[PDB]
Amino acid sequence: XXXXXXXXXXXXXXXXXXXXXXXXXXXXXXXXTRFYDQLNHHIFELERKGGILAIASLIGVEGGNATRIGRFANYLRNLLPSNDPVVMEMASKAIGRLAMAGDTFTAEYVEFEVKRALEWLEGRRHAAVLVLRELAISVPTFFFQQVQPFFDNIFVAVWDPKQAIREGAVAALRACLILTTQRWYRHTFEEAEKGFDDDRIHGALLILNELVRISSMEGERLREEMEEIXXXXXXXXXXXXXXXXXXXXXXXXXSLIQMTILNLLPRLAAFRPTQYLQDTMNHVLSCVKKEKERTAAFQALGLLSVAVRSEFKVYLPRVLDIIRAALPPKVDATVFTCISMLARIQQDIKELLEPMLAVGLSPALTAVLYDLSRQI
């Protein structure tokens, strides 16, 4: 009970590590209690990954009520202020599993974390974002109690000179603005467009991406399915002209900006579908030859083909020659995903089969060829 559990928990810190945390939950479901509190403290202070695996897994297993929240809150509150990568995001998941238990302390515990996150907003700044993102998923009600401080504090913290924050801080804006839609939009577009007028490019474009995508679910529902295999409408010409001017100018200026361009180009075209399309197609086709953007280039090209139906048919001979040249040598996991969305145009796919199958058996290929025969 005590000695054998402490030995198996030591192996989690030192595939097999997550299995011991799952086996500890299976053994704890059958059930001593004091030694598990000491065993969490033994692994905590030294290790931090194996300690989070022990604490977070036993929540929603044994039956932790009032005494368990007060103890384990102190461990999570110490990790978040300053930590390394990977350990930070696991510690933020440990908030979410504890916070969705449905106890009386949830009102106090969540609002303690949300209020302290606004003070910070770099291993400090990105931590507050991971707390706010994970609490928005797990606890929708008590996260809505501080929305006006949320939007105002984040537009100060986003524009600090960092890349790791820009990826996560827009995901906090994603988790917050989705809660507004189901139940602010002017304050997002006003403060974002002020920022555009290379640190002030790739962050603004990701913030504008949220306003295009939430306003029109038609853009995301094409993207969500292929992966498995008023406000924005008013300032459409203002947002589209600023992004197209930013994309056409910044061709080889500063990997990150080219990645955010290929995210927006299809989602802006899916909002409102020739000169905008012709400038898009020149940027997309040229990005395929270059590496880094080669994965995202076909993804944008696949989204654009479904949204823009008739006008894309002129650029079929250009795209299909690149696909016919890319496959013969055998990265290609995305190549198959976009050929399914290209049909979503029939006789040309018959010639595409003799290299497609010659690549080899992959989980992407047989997922595609099955869903290829469904639609056409």
Tab-separated table of C-alpha atoms in Angstrom:
chain	number	residue	atom	x	y	z
A	1	UNK	CA	0.000	0.000	0.000
A	2	UNK	CA	2.622	2.568	1.149
A	3	UNK	CA	6.015	1.182	-0.004
A	4	UNK	CA	4.919	-0.357	-3.351
A	5	UNK	CA	2.932	2.791	-4.336
A	6	UNK	CA	5.900	5.091	-3.548
A	7	UNK	CA	8.202	2.827	-5.644
A	8	UNK	CA	5.899	2.846	-8.720
A	9	UNK	CA	5.340	6.633	-8.370
A	10	UNK	CA	9.148	7.151	-8.329
A	11	UNK	CA	9.329	5.447	-11.774
A	12	UNK	CA	6.912	8.091	-13.197
A	13	UNK	CA	9.395	10.896	-12.377
A	14	UNK	CA	12.490	8.836	-13.317
A	15	UNK	CA	4.773	5.650	-22.219
A	16	UNK	CA	5.640	3.891	-18.923
A	17	UNK	CA	5.419	7.035	-16.708
A	18	UNK	CA	1.811	7.877	-17.699
A	19	UNK	CA	0.871	4.157	-17.352
A	20	UNK	CA	1.887	4.170	-13.644
A	21	UNK	CA	-0.357	7.234	-13.057
A	22	UNK	CA	-3.249	5.353	-14.753
A	23	UNK	CA	-2.490	2.185	-12.706
A	24	UNK	CA	-2.380	4.345	-9.519
A	25	UNK	CA	-5.917	5.590	-10.345
A	26	UNK	CA	-7.043	1.947	-10.907
A	27	UNK	CA	-5.546	0.867	-7.545
A	28	UNK	CA	-6.964	3.994	-5.801
A	29	UNK	CA	-10.454	3.232	-7.227
A	30	UNK	CA	-10.431	-0.070	-5.268
A	31	UNK	CA	-9.474	1.778	-2.042
A	32	UNK	CA	-2.892	4.694	3.188
A	33	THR	CA	-4.339	8.234	2.730
A	34	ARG	CA	-1.526	10.135	4.574
A	35	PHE	CA	1.329	8.448	2.636
A	36	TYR	CA	-0.175	9.567	-0.723
A	37	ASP	CA	-0.141	13.216	0.510
A	38	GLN	CA	3.543	12.752	1.489
A	39	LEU	CA	4.264	10.934	-1.827
A	40	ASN	CA	2.918	13.940	-3.804
A	41	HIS	CA	5.147	16.209	-1.655
A	42	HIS	CA	8.184	13.870	-2.197
A	43	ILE	CA	7.889	14.136	-6.026
A	44	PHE	CA	6.818	17.864	-6.057
A	45	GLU	CA	9.778	19.680	-4.411
A	46	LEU	CA	12.505	18.024	-6.539
A	47	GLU	CA	10.172	15.343	-11.076
A	48	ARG	CA	7.650	18.158	-11.723
A	49	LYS	CA	6.175	16.152	-14.656
A	50	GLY	CA	5.819	12.961	-12.559
A	51	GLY	CA	4.344	14.978	-9.663
A	52	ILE	CA	1.614	16.504	-11.877
A	53	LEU	CA	0.828	12.976	-13.227
A	54	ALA	CA	0.212	11.791	-9.617
A	55	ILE	CA	-1.936	14.772	-8.470
A	56	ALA	CA	-4.023	15.387	-11.647
A	57	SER	CA	-4.860	11.699	-12.396
A	58	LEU	CA	-6.381	10.947	-8.948
A	59	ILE	CA	-8.859	13.873	-9.356
A	60	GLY	CA	-12.157	12.422	-10.666
A	61	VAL	CA	-11.263	8.888	-9.453
A	62	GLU	CA	-11.248	8.501	-5.628
A	63	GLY	CA	-13.763	11.223	-4.669
A	64	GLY	CA	-12.039	14.462	-3.623
A	65	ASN	CA	-14.412	16.898	-1.869
A	66	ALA	CA	-13.494	19.716	0.633
A	67	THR	CA	-10.179	18.672	2.281
A	68	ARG	CA	-8.574	17.751	-1.100
A	69	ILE	CA	-9.113	21.197	-2.767
A	70	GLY	CA	-7.369	23.170	0.031
A	71	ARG	CA	-4.223	20.978	-0.042
A	72	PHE	CA	-3.615	20.506	-3.798
A	73	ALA	CA	-4.354	24.201	-4.572
A	74	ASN	CA	-1.108	25.197	-2.768
A	75	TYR	CA	1.007	22.903	-5.022
A	76	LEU	CA	-0.525	24.314	-8.251
A	77	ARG	CA	-0.275	27.977	-7.085
A	78	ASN	CA	3.531	27.609	-6.569
A	79	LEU	CA	4.294	26.062	-10.014
A	80	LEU	CA	2.463	28.643	-12.189
A	81	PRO	CA	4.238	31.998	-11.343
A	82	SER	CA	7.641	30.750	-12.633
A	83	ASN	CA	8.365	27.434	-14.432
A	84	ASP	CA	10.017	25.774	-17.463
A	85	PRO	CA	8.177	24.808	-20.707
A	86	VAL	CA	6.155	21.514	-20.914
A	87	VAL	CA	5.838	21.436	-17.070
A	88	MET	CA	3.804	24.709	-17.292
A	89	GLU	CA	1.134	23.347	-19.690
A	90	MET	CA	0.760	20.105	-17.655
A	91	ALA	CA	0.300	22.237	-14.495
A	92	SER	CA	-2.369	24.289	-16.342
A	93	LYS	CA	-4.223	21.039	-17.249
A	94	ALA	CA	-4.137	20.135	-13.518
A	95	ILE	CA	-6.183	23.328	-12.856
A	96	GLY	CA	-8.824	22.261	-15.413
A	97	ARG	CA	-9.346	18.762	-13.948
A	98	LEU	CA	-9.597	20.171	-10.383
A	99	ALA	CA	-11.765	23.166	-11.440
A	100	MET	CA	-14.474	21.043	-13.194
A	101	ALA	CA	-15.125	18.877	-10.069
A	102	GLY	CA	-18.274	20.888	-9.197
A	103	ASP	CA	-17.561	21.862	-5.568
A	104	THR	CA	-18.392	24.951	-3.440
A	105	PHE	CA	-14.713	26.113	-3.463
A	106	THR	CA	-14.803	26.377	-7.326
A	107	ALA	CA	-16.153	29.969	-7.062
A	108	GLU	CA	-13.204	30.980	-4.823
A	109	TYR	CA	-10.444	28.850	-6.460
A	110	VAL	CA	-11.135	29.860	-10.108
A	111	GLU	CA	-11.548	33.602	-9.340
A	112	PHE	CA	-8.299	33.524	-7.289
A	113	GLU	CA	-6.456	32.223	-10.400
A	114	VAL	CA	-8.228	34.599	-12.866
A	115	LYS	CA	-7.558	37.747	-10.753
A	116	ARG	CA	-3.833	36.892	-10.301
A	117	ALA	CA	-3.493	36.139	-14.061
A	118	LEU	CA	-4.581	39.730	-14.906
A	119	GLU	CA	-1.798	41.156	-12.659
A	120	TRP	CA	1.021	39.550	-14.705
A	121	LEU	CA	-0.614	40.360	-18.068
A	122	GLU	CA	8.854	35.434	-20.209
A	123	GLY	CA	7.887	32.469	-17.998
A	124	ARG	CA	5.495	34.761	-16.037
A	125	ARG	CA	3.350	36.264	-18.835
A	126	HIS	CA	2.717	33.010	-20.772
A	127	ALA	CA	1.749	31.216	-17.506
A	128	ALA	CA	-1.217	33.583	-16.913
A	129	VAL	CA	-2.431	32.836	-20.476
A	130	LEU	CA	-2.335	29.034	-19.884
A	131	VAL	CA	-4.364	29.522	-16.662
A	132	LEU	CA	-6.981	31.682	-18.467
A	133	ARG	CA	-7.204	29.364	-21.526
A	134	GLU	CA	-7.682	26.133	-19.509
A	135	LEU	CA	-10.135	27.737	-17.021
A	136	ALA	CA	-12.247	28.981	-19.988
A	137	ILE	CA	-12.621	25.369	-21.253
A	138	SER	CA	-13.340	23.741	-17.853
A	139	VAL	CA	-15.318	26.529	-16.095
A	140	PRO	CA	-17.449	28.724	-18.462
A	141	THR	CA	-19.619	30.448	-15.780
A	142	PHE	CA	-17.041	31.814	-13.281
A	143	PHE	CA	-14.623	32.737	-16.127
A	144	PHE	CA	-17.311	35.186	-17.417
A	145	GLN	CA	-17.196	37.141	-14.092
A	146	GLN	CA	-14.061	39.105	-15.200
A	147	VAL	CA	-14.356	39.755	-18.983
A	148	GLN	CA	-13.744	43.557	-19.063
A	149	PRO	CA	-10.387	43.189	-17.218
A	150	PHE	CA	-9.536	40.218	-19.531
A	151	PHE	CA	-9.703	42.089	-22.878
A	152	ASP	CA	-8.045	45.305	-21.587
A	153	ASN	CA	-5.050	43.672	-19.810
A	154	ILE	CA	-4.222	41.214	-22.655
A	155	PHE	CA	-3.764	43.883	-25.414
A	156	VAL	CA	-0.906	45.269	-23.239
A	157	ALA	CA	0.682	41.802	-22.664
A	158	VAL	CA	0.310	40.389	-26.240
A	159	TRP	CA	2.483	43.069	-27.914
A	160	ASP	CA	5.627	42.393	-25.806
A	161	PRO	CA	8.549	41.127	-27.952
A	162	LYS	CA	7.832	37.363	-27.764
A	163	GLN	CA	6.768	34.516	-30.104
A	164	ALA	CA	5.745	31.783	-27.598
A	165	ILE	CA	3.245	34.228	-25.998
A	166	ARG	CA	1.713	35.148	-29.423
A	167	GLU	CA	0.762	31.485	-30.045
A	168	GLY	CA	-0.930	31.046	-26.640
A	169	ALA	CA	-2.360	34.551	-26.054
A	170	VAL	CA	-4.534	34.387	-29.213
A	171	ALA	CA	-5.756	30.944	-27.972
A	172	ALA	CA	-6.950	32.734	-24.785
A	173	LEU	CA	-8.750	35.260	-27.043
A	174	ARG	CA	-10.163	32.216	-28.923
A	175	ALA	CA	-11.470	30.612	-25.695
A	176	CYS	CA	-12.966	33.937	-24.492
A	177	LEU	CA	-14.671	35.124	-27.729
A	178	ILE	CA	-16.372	31.704	-28.266
A	179	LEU	CA	-18.107	32.162	-24.861
A	180	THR	CA	-19.369	35.610	-26.029
A	181	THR	CA	-20.824	34.221	-29.327
A	182	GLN	CA	-23.025	31.496	-27.751
A	183	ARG	CA	-24.478	33.895	-25.126
A	184	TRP	CA	-16.382	43.616	-27.074
A	185	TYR	CA	-16.201	42.777	-30.814
A	186	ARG	CA	-15.726	46.504	-31.589
A	187	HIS	CA	-13.018	46.819	-28.888
A	188	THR	CA	-11.097	43.882	-30.465
A	189	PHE	CA	-11.050	45.244	-34.059
A	190	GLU	CA	-10.368	48.864	-32.970
A	191	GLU	CA	-7.388	47.962	-30.732
A	192	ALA	CA	-6.054	45.374	-33.262
A	193	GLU	CA	-6.170	47.785	-36.257
A	194	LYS	CA	-4.370	50.464	-34.157
A	195	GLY	CA	-1.488	47.962	-33.871
A	196	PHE	CA	-1.003	47.490	-37.650
A	197	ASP	CA	-0.556	51.264	-38.260
A	198	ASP	CA	7.972	43.060	-38.074
A	199	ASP	CA	6.934	42.784	-34.351
A	200	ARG	CA	3.605	44.485	-35.323
A	201	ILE	CA	2.503	42.020	-38.091
A	202	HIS	CA	2.313	38.305	-37.112
A	203	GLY	CA	0.441	39.005	-33.823
A	204	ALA	CA	-2.195	41.338	-35.311
A	205	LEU	CA	-2.889	38.915	-38.194
A	206	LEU	CA	-3.617	36.077	-35.687
A	207	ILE	CA	-5.976	38.408	-33.720
A	208	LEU	CA	-7.759	39.373	-36.985
A	209	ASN	CA	-8.020	35.607	-37.754
A	210	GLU	CA	-10.299	35.200	-34.683
A	211	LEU	CA	-12.654	37.968	-35.921
A	212	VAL	CA	-12.929	36.409	-39.427
A	213	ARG	CA	-13.427	32.835	-38.126
A	214	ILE	CA	-15.957	33.516	-35.313
A	215	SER	CA	-18.069	35.815	-37.562
A	216	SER	CA	-18.278	33.027	-40.194
A	217	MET	CA	-18.344	29.339	-39.109
A	218	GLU	CA	-18.397	28.388	-42.848
A	219	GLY	CA	-14.594	28.928	-42.963
A	220	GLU	CA	-13.709	26.738	-39.941
A	221	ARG	CA	-16.080	23.802	-40.742
A	222	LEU	CA	-14.040	23.088	-43.916
A	223	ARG	CA	-10.789	23.182	-41.873
A	224	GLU	CA	-12.128	21.117	-38.911
A	225	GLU	CA	-13.232	18.179	-41.127
A	226	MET	CA	-10.046	17.854	-43.271
A	227	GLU	CA	-7.795	17.637	-40.148
A	228	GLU	CA	-9.596	14.422	-39.045
A	229	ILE	CA	-9.013	12.862	-42.507
A	230	UNK	CA	-22.359	42.390	-38.399
A	231	UNK	CA	-18.996	43.294	-36.782
A	232	UNK	CA	-16.491	41.709	-39.214
A	233	UNK	CA	-18.820	42.079	-42.253
A	234	UNK	CA	-18.856	45.902	-41.786
A	235	UNK	CA	-15.040	46.274	-41.903
A	236	UNK	CA	-14.394	43.572	-44.547
A	237	UNK	CA	-12.827	45.784	-47.252
A	238	UNK	CA	-10.716	47.512	-44.542
A	239	UNK	CA	-9.448	44.201	-43.075
A	240	UNK	CA	-8.965	42.449	-46.461
A	241	UNK	CA	-7.050	45.390	-48.039
A	242	UNK	CA	-4.699	45.728	-45.017
A	243	UNK	CA	-3.912	41.964	-44.988
A	244	UNK	CA	-3.497	41.691	-48.800
A	245	UNK	CA	-1.190	44.764	-48.757
A	246	UNK	CA	0.730	43.232	-45.811
A	247	UNK	CA	1.002	39.826	-47.560
A	248	UNK	CA	1.992	41.177	-51.011
A	249	UNK	CA	4.684	43.454	-49.499
A	250	UNK	CA	6.093	41.038	-46.877
A	251	UNK	CA	7.034	38.211	-49.266
A	252	UNK	CA	10.485	37.440	-47.782
A	253	UNK	CA	10.798	40.028	-44.960
A	254	UNK	CA	10.316	38.095	-41.687
A	255	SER	CA	8.735	32.144	-41.696
A	256	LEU	CA	6.277	33.451	-39.052
A	257	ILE	CA	4.498	36.092	-41.194
A	258	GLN	CA	4.248	33.695	-44.202
A	259	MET	CA	2.609	31.107	-41.882
A	260	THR	CA	-0.069	33.585	-40.669
A	261	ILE	CA	-0.673	34.785	-44.282
A	262	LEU	CA	-1.567	31.235	-45.417
A	263	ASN	CA	-3.976	30.934	-42.430
A	264	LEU	CA	-5.894	34.114	-43.413
A	265	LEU	CA	-5.845	33.892	-47.271
A	266	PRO	CA	-8.417	31.025	-47.339
A	267	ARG	CA	-10.522	32.307	-44.375
A	268	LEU	CA	-10.753	35.818	-45.906
A	269	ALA	CA	-11.692	34.253	-49.291
A	270	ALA	CA	-14.260	31.944	-47.591
A	271	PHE	CA	-15.891	35.061	-46.052
A	272	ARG	CA	-16.333	36.858	-49.427
A	273	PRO	CA	-15.107	35.403	-52.781
A	274	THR	CA	-11.127	38.181	-58.931
A	275	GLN	CA	-8.149	40.553	-58.270
A	276	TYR	CA	-8.066	39.441	-54.591
A	277	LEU	CA	-8.071	35.780	-55.756
A	278	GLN	CA	-5.355	36.390	-58.414
A	279	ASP	CA	-3.030	38.026	-55.834
A	280	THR	CA	-3.742	35.110	-53.421
A	281	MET	CA	-2.945	32.384	-56.008
A	282	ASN	CA	0.422	34.031	-56.866
A	283	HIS	CA	1.444	33.945	-53.166
A	284	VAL	CA	0.167	30.373	-52.540
A	285	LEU	CA	1.785	28.722	-55.621
A	286	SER	CA	5.197	30.392	-55.020
A	287	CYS	CA	5.200	29.262	-51.335
A	288	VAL	CA	4.982	25.536	-52.347
A	289	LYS	CA	8.510	25.462	-53.892
A	290	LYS	CA	9.961	26.960	-50.680
A	291	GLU	CA	10.171	24.787	-47.532
A	292	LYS	CA	8.687	25.784	-44.102
A	293	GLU	CA	5.510	26.995	-45.891
A	294	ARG	CA	5.199	23.780	-48.026
A	295	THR	CA	2.889	22.111	-45.453
A	296	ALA	CA	0.665	25.189	-44.941
A	297	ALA	CA	0.666	26.122	-48.683
A	298	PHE	CA	-1.368	23.079	-49.782
A	299	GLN	CA	-3.649	23.512	-46.703
A	300	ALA	CA	-4.526	27.065	-47.810
A	301	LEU	CA	-4.815	25.817	-51.415
A	302	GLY	CA	-7.289	23.097	-50.303
A	303	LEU	CA	-9.463	25.534	-48.311
A	304	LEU	CA	-9.502	28.044	-51.220
A	305	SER	CA	-10.690	25.373	-53.715
A	306	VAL	CA	-13.857	24.519	-51.703
A	307	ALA	CA	-14.739	28.159	-50.878
A	308	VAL	CA	-13.934	29.622	-54.322
A	309	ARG	CA	-15.604	27.062	-56.633
A	310	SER	CA	-15.638	28.272	-60.260
A	311	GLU	CA	-12.739	30.794	-60.378
A	312	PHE	CA	-10.202	28.221	-59.050
A	313	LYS	CA	-10.834	25.942	-62.100
A	314	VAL	CA	-8.541	28.163	-64.255
A	315	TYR	CA	-5.583	27.327	-61.922
A	316	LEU	CA	-6.092	23.508	-62.025
A	317	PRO	CA	-3.214	22.815	-64.523
A	318	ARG	CA	-0.710	24.758	-62.320
A	319	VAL	CA	-1.567	22.985	-59.024
A	320	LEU	CA	-1.826	19.431	-60.434
A	321	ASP	CA	1.637	19.603	-62.110
A	322	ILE	CA	3.159	20.451	-58.670
A	323	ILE	CA	1.345	17.475	-57.045
A	324	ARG	CA	2.454	15.181	-59.936
A	325	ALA	CA	6.103	16.312	-59.464
A	326	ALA	CA	6.104	16.130	-55.617
A	327	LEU	CA	4.905	12.500	-55.184
A	328	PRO	CA	7.307	10.463	-57.498
A	329	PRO	CA	10.489	10.728	-55.255
A	330	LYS	CA	8.803	8.543	-52.583
A	331	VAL	CA	5.709	15.715	-45.329
A	332	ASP	CA	3.319	13.955	-47.765
A	333	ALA	CA	0.710	13.328	-44.986
A	334	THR	CA	-0.748	16.774	-45.837
A	335	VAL	CA	-0.427	16.236	-49.650
A	336	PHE	CA	-3.158	13.538	-49.585
A	337	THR	CA	-5.476	15.581	-47.271
A	338	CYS	CA	-5.613	18.453	-49.799
A	339	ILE	CA	-6.261	16.228	-52.879
A	340	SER	CA	-9.523	15.129	-51.155
A	341	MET	CA	-10.471	18.815	-50.625
A	342	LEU	CA	-9.513	19.585	-54.278
A	343	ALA	CA	-12.347	17.310	-55.508
A	344	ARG	CA	-14.631	18.821	-52.820
A	345	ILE	CA	-12.836	18.033	-61.102
A	346	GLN	CA	-12.975	14.215	-61.536
A	347	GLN	CA	-11.170	12.866	-64.671
A	348	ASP	CA	-7.853	14.465	-63.595
A	349	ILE	CA	-7.903	12.482	-60.284
A	350	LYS	CA	-7.705	9.179	-62.285
A	351	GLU	CA	-4.133	9.999	-63.399
A	352	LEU	CA	-3.294	11.099	-59.798
A	353	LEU	CA	-3.876	7.513	-58.497
A	354	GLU	CA	-0.746	5.893	-60.069
A	355	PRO	CA	1.709	7.983	-57.947
A	356	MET	CA	-0.612	8.333	-54.864
A	357	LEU	CA	-0.670	4.570	-54.195
A	358	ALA	CA	3.052	4.208	-55.097
A	359	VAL	CA	3.996	6.312	-52.001
A	360	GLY	CA	2.954	3.547	-49.574
A	361	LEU	CA	0.433	2.576	-46.897
A	362	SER	CA	-0.048	5.442	-44.419
A	363	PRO	CA	-2.986	6.232	-42.061
A	364	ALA	CA	-3.544	9.496	-44.013
A	365	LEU	CA	-3.656	7.758	-47.449
A	366	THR	CA	-6.289	5.090	-46.636
A	367	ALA	CA	-8.338	7.718	-44.722
A	368	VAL	CA	-8.287	9.869	-47.898
A	369	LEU	CA	-8.946	7.152	-50.541
A	370	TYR	CA	-11.941	5.901	-48.491
A	371	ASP	CA	-13.399	9.442	-48.162
A	372	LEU	CA	-12.459	10.126	-51.837
A	373	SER	CA	-14.804	7.314	-52.981
A	374	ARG	CA	-17.567	8.654	-50.653
A	375	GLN	CA	-17.872	12.106	-52.256
A	376	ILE	CA	-16.973	11.260	-55.911
